[model samples]
Target: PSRHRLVHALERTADLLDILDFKSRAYRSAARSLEELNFTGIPKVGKGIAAELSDFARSGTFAPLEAAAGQLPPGLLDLLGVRGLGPKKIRSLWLAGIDSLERLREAAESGELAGLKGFGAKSAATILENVVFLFEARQRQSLRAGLAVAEELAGALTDLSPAPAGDVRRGLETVRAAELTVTGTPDDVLARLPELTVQVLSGDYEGVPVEIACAPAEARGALDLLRSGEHFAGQVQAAAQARGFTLTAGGLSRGDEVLPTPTEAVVFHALDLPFRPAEYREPEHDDLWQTLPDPAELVTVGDLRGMIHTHSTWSDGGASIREMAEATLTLGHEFLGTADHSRAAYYANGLTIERLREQLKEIRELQRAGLPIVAGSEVDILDDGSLDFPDDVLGELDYVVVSVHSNFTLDAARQTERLIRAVSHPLVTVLGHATGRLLLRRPGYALDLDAVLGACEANGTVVEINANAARLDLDWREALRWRERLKFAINTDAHVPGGLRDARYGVMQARKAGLTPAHVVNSLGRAEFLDFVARQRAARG
Candidate 1:
């Protein structure tokens, strides 16, 4: 009864709590306590809400909550999720007979919403925009999910080497579709694609869009030319034309004298240019590719020597420290950096100063016994941008990773200043999850990101590319801008042993950003990692 009915039943109580203007924390706590039906001992507000919540929990309805809702219909509740629609505005709209989202949208479109008291054309337009965004956002999937789907679909094809294209290949944070480039006759490829489980639109490759190039087995370079970004492909064509050559989906030719190109490397060699990786085939890199380091020099999974920013049973992780270390060593990493939550994250069993000291002592003992582990903390950056742990406590740790775990509603100036302050701290070793975004779910908090990145570069602070599947923060595009300016740590921010393997995803992101081994801190050996930290500390003085 508790499991099935409690969830939806509490939704009504939460609505009531919102109607009465209860603080967010107050209502959130009450909802959490009620979810477990653990009200044997309760505070005044908690007891009152618990009793009412209990009535709804068992009986399927609570009379007092319904009565308090008054004449306003239930449909009006949804407006609360939209920006600028507070209790007062919701009540006003309900009183004005705009109860449902559909009705409100109709009113706004017909100018009836703008005519209402306290609402103007500007407000009406903003509300419409928010409603449209909320509706469209429901259809999106994160990059990780999109990539998995693309790979699955590609794997089902037998006659072609399917190369991903479009948003998934470009690593967009959210994707609605996947595209692929395959080399095969159209008929053979189409016959094999129907085995995929996703919905298939007619004239397309099952659900994915496919580019087919039916060329000879030794002329596969024709397919790569077609797979390029439109802008870069156009440049290549124009350059070929200037030199009296014809570049096409059938490979390069000069007046029907075909070039002997069997691969991208051979084609590029014919063009008198070095081969470029598929990741750098975007419009902005049409000519810039010539200047980048050799693809061989870019970072790869094998370059990473340490697993940092990992969680364990010390906080909200699934594995114990020893188990996490064992998994790390098994994965061929030389060291582990344990970064459990700091005290301010009470929700995650965050450590107090005493708990931190004990954990540090245990980590030291393990190191002495040859475990090759480093003591660190993913410390919270408080509301005012102060480190949750003071300098002395942080200084004692092998390294510090500061991040924002709460108070994300601040405006741009405040958010930027908050992050800048934390990165500027002398003891801070890395700035974790710079954007704090959860892809396809929530946008990054509003902040001047450039200013914050500048601060990190100026202070010798390393930036983190948080490799959690849900949050590949410090987006790869942005990382490219700072690649030559600051050091980076491709950290998993892992909460479990499985998360340790996510370092490969981080390496993919790093390669996309054009990062090499020297650009990453964790790519260093354990002793070199310590020396790097020492240099960061020395720079402070």
Candidate 2:
């Protein structure tokens, strides 16, 4: 019981160390060193924590440590799993008698969390959402989320060169684990990694699973191999074996001869195969990549000249129209298109007819003031397969972006007809967030996507790659089917200034679809886009 109790205290110590952002290396080293000393050692462990470490080492428990410093109940540690809740807020909740996750969830749902000192309705909603997400997702994180955590781990291991690899690097929309290729000694890397965060397994060094590549080769090469999809990696290994060489974590090896190729290019050169772009390395593309067009011509973030389909305070957005324009200009974009919500989306503070006209007046004023802003509305596709805005109102705007905001339970045929009707409308410029699928949250509403795309193709209606990270709608795989037949817009459905930068993620998705600047509607400059829109309208007439 004493030994088990000591282990429990040690586990809590580790948890607190993470919460406090203590240097993990020192914490683990000091703990191990003091434990080995049989409760006698004076090794320094940073200024604030050494005494606690000494007390823990001597007492075989954290009682002395907690007596000196305030104790954080184990229940609060579980609350940390919720994204935005920090120690201070958790402490507040604990003191308020909301000690467990169930209690916190109940409070959040009942508006009790909003009554707290720092939390408001918005924050309370966000906390509740995160709490629910924590329960559902547990240890799983999305691709972007995992990358962020992996980068945090890398930051802690300053002595090692850590390169994020695997599906996360390949830009898969989601991932179960974050993989990394680290260049450092086993002990050195192991000391800095939090045991709870990384489940160490086996291999080159401190058993951090077969997923982590701890190769002796340069970090970049290790990253390349790891980023190479599973099938591609196997193909490369088979090729290496046929050439009397072996592909290993250390590098290509041939009986008594180990070659450390520092870069991916060198490995490709040795194999006598043309270099494959990271995006094109998925599967069965070995010969296709050989004959593929230059990767340089792929649609890149730089190809974007302006952004459209953005929201501002005229609707539910956080920024003013002028601030949205300024942010676009700040990002080196030549134009900004504002698409505030239309009346049917009242839940999103959708603009009423009067509010819509007032917003248009404001946009025109901004334009007259020399801002390169375009007036638009993300008008809803009404339940009856008609637009929320009348044709006269839509025609007055620079563009009309039609989207489905609710009523997602319609049959596939009805959903298809609903979308096709909106797409076929002459005033519609783009189909915004076509599928309305929230990643991992819900599947897209039942609809015949091909029929909808066919309508888009026939009407010259551009489909959007909604780049809001959470909803990279018009999934890249589907985009590939219509790439040649229809135009695409990599629009950041940004509601705030920071969301404007989400265009990069859209660009990433476009690249995955093998789209080029020519394929993307908004890749054109301001004048070109306006000219294209004019032609589209004229052709419809």
Candidate 3:
């Protein structure tokens, strides 16, 4: 039965309850007789709608709803997973625009929907937000782009090896024993070692595998930061937080006093508290046991599948598309999203209309030939925050990503305003690296995230979680805020082919922000993925 039928059934239930107390016992008896004949077994109701029933159950209504519920075919509610579409709005959108997330998004944006009876400003706003969250959840960076960051970090740390010891004899003597040997930073000796043997690399740093032998013994003397897979730093952080103190790379601050090399137990002791287990060092204590790793698990370049954001000679990338793909595949990824700059971004060799068409043809053929290529583009968000291209042009690509490349000088409010406008654009799918930041060295343009996130919620633009080590722009703090509300694409924002393998770094940053596999976009496979992208295209069209 349709919704009307379900409503009728509910009304009948209410009527029957009334009859049991007041009037219509005869009618209730007749209804019972009809149900006895008509209703026999459970009908096939798809999991999609069943999930709603499941949700309703979580509210302590599941037991009751189940008793009253009859099985039926899954409806448009299943498509809410398509992004930008939720259940409440789906009812009206499906009813108004003929049951499609993409079409609903399009109709809402185009002013074509204003004519609809109840599609007002607030309703439109909610729909747009859901859509954007969906898009953001699915966007990814190219492996080539991501690998550049990985290589950069790897090179920086690798090249920073310590000097050779005139006392190499003692260093070796210490290693001969099955005991711990910490290293010093800027190690001159370890840097030039042509190659290292594997046996010396195996050890436990706080119960985690650590390659201590590969590091020069004197290295720890110079560096406060632990390069090994050790929980020493994390332990210190826990100590500080537990004692109501703040910890940073430089020092720990509590009131006016600052402590260095603060240990977890030390901070707890300072706060007149008992030591907490390393694994159970969460700021919040749960009802049950809360154990954490004995040590921090190190994220390495080898863990990545692909980088989500990268360009090519087709746009501004230094490498050709095929060359980039080869580099990424060599680095170990199933596929890469070659997101070149869109036409509006003329400074980056943004694709012209003709170039875009040609690229699409090549991509279609490559996909047909079974080559793993996810052809995408990073379009420019204009000063007014509108997308660089029209729907007709955007609809052709596998994914249409948008970024804030030009005119980043605006104030926070204006910056957020611009971002909101662009995110709301139906043709623009994902918002690139929100702050355009440069980490550790340079500060990114400031944008109010509260406002930006609010706009993102209202528009259907997915936000890019950049993985470039230098510009882990969507840093952990901002990312945590999005934890409950949105999905993110851990992008490498790569410019070279090797850069594509940097998804590891992006994932690392995302993890730091509490992002999980479910929060990542590139994790999805082709068939289900195409439906989301197709919805975007359909709506924009």
Candidate 4:
């Protein structure tokens, strides 16, 4: 049993040595040769390798592996977790300053990975996707799981009036952990929460880490602000310090006294600044905290008048058009836009030309029945940057959503050009899910997103902030950065009646962007929205 493990250890040393350009293939050959043998004295790996292996077998030590690891950059070994990335590829990427997964993702997102020797766009895209999977797998809880634990604790501890904290309070799509800050004694909090510690009771519930921090009732504002994010809270703390006051988790203070900060707004008022609410209390707010607007002016779910980029049974959606429309009405929306998949996405039962014509007739009939439906199609952008349907066919629809559904292997330049062409199409009302990212799974494809966004801006194409939790494409980070340049649609990309509710997630995304009613296109009333689409196509045409 011990010999079997020793053989595997020899193989790892071989791989590490090989990465460092050392001639250690003989160690691997010896390890494989010894896999079934009874004796493991390491006699076959002659010369320096045999000596090293013999010592490794004797003391369970491998100096060669240690030396190889020491030669690489800090955190470089972590790259080994990525599938299809071997020592050779990792070494090459390391030469290009991709020693860490964060830098590797940066390279992938910017199309810089494809420019390296022996690397192509397709490989770069896959590597990027796998990189995301690896990092996300190691990261903290997802918001879906995190929020459940957060809400559960908040509801259960209603007596304490514990304010929501951590990533949940900041409205992050993903969370580090679920946190709730309460006003009370440590003994009371520890008694209520299961398997918890003192003062700060961090418990495990809903398969996610849930923490409860106890403080005096007056420090609710300070504690919640401190828990939002490290950088955001620290910035606010510094601002308080600059104003001759001290901001701490315990309380806002002066030189000698701990002043009461019962609410976050109170802390802000003491600093003579506007109250930047929980959602806007993010890293993005650090540089621009002083100019932040009142939270009431930000776009909320109630501001959305219609649903866009939805699907139905005519394509891949689980619901029928009538059901989707009724569901939209149930949500208090003024109208529903059916954006079924076009002919190219046969897997989604995308609409053929004949089928689309029939669906259009059906929509018109339903419109006459007062269902308030808008005819639209999520037309696939073909391999060569052309729409799946011709201009004549696209002109039949009230609006068009141009998107990439295939050929994601194209080079970065090609991918950017493809999107630019689609957005420039006169009939294209919006560019759907700008990067096509599936959160925590795929990091999207290799393309210069800034270049593509620049094209969309010049072409008057709105970008979609997909509301689906799995694919919050045009994520809040990008939404915040591009808020002024273009109006965005917080779309559900909904496929069923239940999917209409996904708009709440999208609204949360918009809030993180600090977007306002004026920054969102769907904020327009039904009549104004119809005219808006007509005006876009007319101008582009």
Candidate 5:
């Protein structure tokens, strides 16, 4: 954890250096070294980074991250959470009296941000969309409920070929509204979805009304593209205007004639823009849309090869290990990783050391019987950042998913240290549910995430994107940022057999982060996955 903390601090310091228009390669290299090196004795690293790591070892803190954060506004911390804003923009906006997210929103709304030297109405509107998402996140419903109700609402209008739009189509965990893009006129939609039954379940500040757009079949593509999201549509519209065209919900037009854009791809082609999937059309993609892979290349549910991080009758799971493995096979996955809880999770009937061994023995028997399964444990991370089980027991397991089931009351520094220590364990293969948050019901506990994820990268630990409907921890934004540097496991954390299908939810979140099958460790075949296990354990050992 100390190493993770130091690594995070160094990376940020490097970013700050870059923002200052100074060289930052040394800090970045130092961070990379911290993430990749495995050391039991004194090790080699850049002398400056060595000193920082040493200081962190002694005090469990890195001063440089704070020093770097101090370089910006009192909203120093706030700018990072603003989706569209980065250090360069932050520095610019700070000088323009837009230090906080609220200020930035006001600037955009008042035409002040649009009037900035390099920003225009389009960019300002794009940024405003991001800020809106930041604030609206707190006022949304779980994608589960939203999708359910949306499908219900769609079923009510089968005549229009009801197509979902906005955040729900974008696979957001929290949806702003249940919206649709159907082929018809405003009156047609109104006749189908009568004004009396359309009770709008509003969102905070955003006022998520029962917003539905209707267009003729000829312009349905334009309507879908426009309703896919406000942020990206505004961007496309702006670019269209730049190139002698106009884009609107009704249709795309050049001079006096409308373009026959039957599909979103056609619209993109007409505008000379690259095609992106509905999932990749979010505001987050505005700055880098041209670079992402096509929808065909992103991680789909069909790409999943192994079913990992499940519960069984040995712990609190409702199904037995055999049942879970059989179900995994039925789903066409090559392997199953049944990771029941350790003794620290006594409330879930967490296994004692003896019971743990019995479970492992059962797992081996099942494997010998031709069921592809690996025995693992979701061991708890204690207050001191140690695992619930000794290294000896951890070493015996095929893999370990180190987790924290309680004690979320720690301050950020301590929680960061706790998480770092947990992921840093050599025997640990994956870090389970980095935040114990349950969507809409509870928020994640405090921790320095930069440090913890940094440590995971350093320790060769796989980070879990827990697929439980209620807890989509290590949220999509983090995945989006770290997608290139880290290996992720979209684990279901399923307790029941039916929970196995929740992989779709995890895939949705992963897709939103622009993750490909190559980014997910579980996409590996069974033998290859075991090789990864053996290699990781040996390297740590």
Candidate 6:
């Protein structure tokens, strides 16, 4: 008995630690499992968490996390390590025939990979590599790891609820009364009971359990009992003991005798508890929360000054710098930053040193002529993690945006290390859309995010929240990690004129991450921003 007890305790301890690790990583499953374990962490971690998840599960604490997790796109977990695949591209593939590596790999082998949106030779090659090297050779993610826990939880609760009853409301709902209450929006309670006829209460909010007595309409006591969440259930059982009968959904009764108590007030009065506030009566009240700064605390799209990381005629881009600059200004930005690709990215017609210098001269003239422009280069990071441009040429730019335009073939650990080195480059000024991800269509290189985010915080490097709808790299959730450690530049990552407007997409992603105007580097005013630019320029000196 003692040995078995010891083993069980050890297993539970390990499970609890797993929860903490997963919670810290923001994997929704580990976070939810903590609740089933009663959220009671080892005595050392304390009740603050234990009480929170438990209470929040019963109350409002779990609502936001659940809702936020659901709103996030599906297939994120599976695509994370797909070389060249980003959120946007994954979304694209999702729209196409590919939903997982297995499907994608099959397509890649069949030449169907090239048929997907945003995919080219580079992407197809990456997909093929991901199959032979990244997956079939080694499993990086669980088959079902990508789906959120709420999905599973809802599925389970649905199976548990009474089957095929009245109009069903499958989620949690608040039971507001004079005393202790149940407060949670839809999703708190899901599933319905059978035989005992029930209907969703006539209301907008869901998850509110509604039980109706079959025989007599006066038996409304059952609905009120269910409303108080589990709290009222316990109270009714306790009160019935004193009344020589039992209270339940089948109508308060004792040994086949029924007593109808018809209202929530009467139900609570029987229990002898005071009223619950509209918000607090939730039975699913699990209390897990922290006072983090609101996402709206700082900058918004209104604070934008100019579009950055754009390409022009010097690269594979359609428009010339002049046309792009005019478009940037017309979009109401105070300035624009031109970041044509470097020569190493031949496909993009990246600039050589000679071409770059000439472009700089023209930019200087345009600036002296009072044009709203900032000169920069979105240079590629070589296979060895070095910038494509030499320091001499790089030093002359207003800023440098170091990006990964090639060599995404490295192993996960090595890729992260390489990105760290690039971010640590003194002249990097900003780390360009670290993942290079494309939504709904393609995946990018896989690097350990914790290491990359840590490096950015330590290196004073600003990570770009690339705004392209198809490539919102530096995912807002991970980028939000910078709230305390670093600042972010929300750039358009545009290769064309219309691309500049993608900044709006970046702002939306930022908002989701709770980023404020104050948190964004570009949201800084002109003088302060110029000072930052000058600082980067002086660093070269």
Which regions of candidate 1 are displaced past 4 Å? 1-141, 153-159, 162-180, 190-193, 196-215, 241-246, 253-260
- Model 3 lDDT at residue 133: 52
Residue-wise C-alpha lDDT for candidate 5, range 1-541, written one tens digit per residue: 5567667877877766554222277777767777875522334355556766676777676655533332222233555777766667765664454544545666786899999887899999988888667655556755654565566567767898888888778878878776766787665666766652332222123223345667788778888888877787787788889999988877889999889866777888998876777877777776765676667788877788988998876775657888888888888788899898887764355788999989888888987899988778889888899999998988788789988777766899999999998888878899988887766655888988989999998888999998866677779888988988899999987666766777888999898788899999889988888889788767764
Q: Please give, for residues 243-352, the per-residue lDDT of candidate 2 as tens digits.
A: 88777666766799766678878777776767778877766345555554567888877788878998776765657889889989989888998898777664355788
Q: Could you give the C-alpha RMSD of every candidate to the true structure, in order shown?
A: 14.3, 18.2, 25.1, 15.7, 17.9, 20.2
Candidate 2 TM-score versus the reference: 0.72
User: Model 6 — which ten-residue stretch has the worst lDDT?
Assistant: 172-181
Q: Which regions of candidate 6 fall more than 4 Å away from where they truly are?
A: 1-290, 294-298, 536-541
- Name the top lDDT candidate: 4
lDDT of 1 at 486: 84
Give the alpha-carbon lDDT of every model: 0.71, 0.70, 0.50, 0.76, 0.75, 0.56
- Candidate 4 accuracy as TM-score: 0.72
Each candidate structure's TM-score, on Cα atoms with residue i matched to residue i, is: 0.71, 0.72, 0.50, 0.72, 0.70, 0.48
RMSD of 6: 20.2
Task: Determine which window of 10 residues in candidate 4 has minimal summed lDDT.
Answer: 66-75
Can you tell me which runs of candidate 3 are displaced by over 4 Å?
1-306, 440-442, 535-541
Which residue runs of candidate 5 sit more than 4 Å off their true CA positions? 1-139, 185-211
Give the per-residue lDDT digits (tens) of candidate 6, residues 407-473: 5558998899788888878777788878856443347777888888787777677788877554566
Q: Residue-wise lDDT of candidate 3 within 1-541, one digit each (tens)?
A: 3433433333343342231121134323433443433422223333333444345435534322232221100122224354544334444443342233334445555776565666677766666566545433432312222222223223434544322211111111011112222343323323533232345333321111223332333223212332211344465556557777775534446778755433334444555655443222222222221232222342334434545567666664556667766776777665767788776554345678899888878777766876677777887787787787787787777677777766656877788888877777766657787876643223667788777777665554567777654455566567665666766677777665544544655665555455555566666554545576567546552
Score candidate 5 by TM-score against the native: 0.70
Which model scores highest in TM-score? 2
Candidate 2, residue 262: the lDDT equals 80
After TM-score superposition, the amount by which residue 208's alpha carbon in candidate 4 deviates from its true location, in angstroms, is 2.3
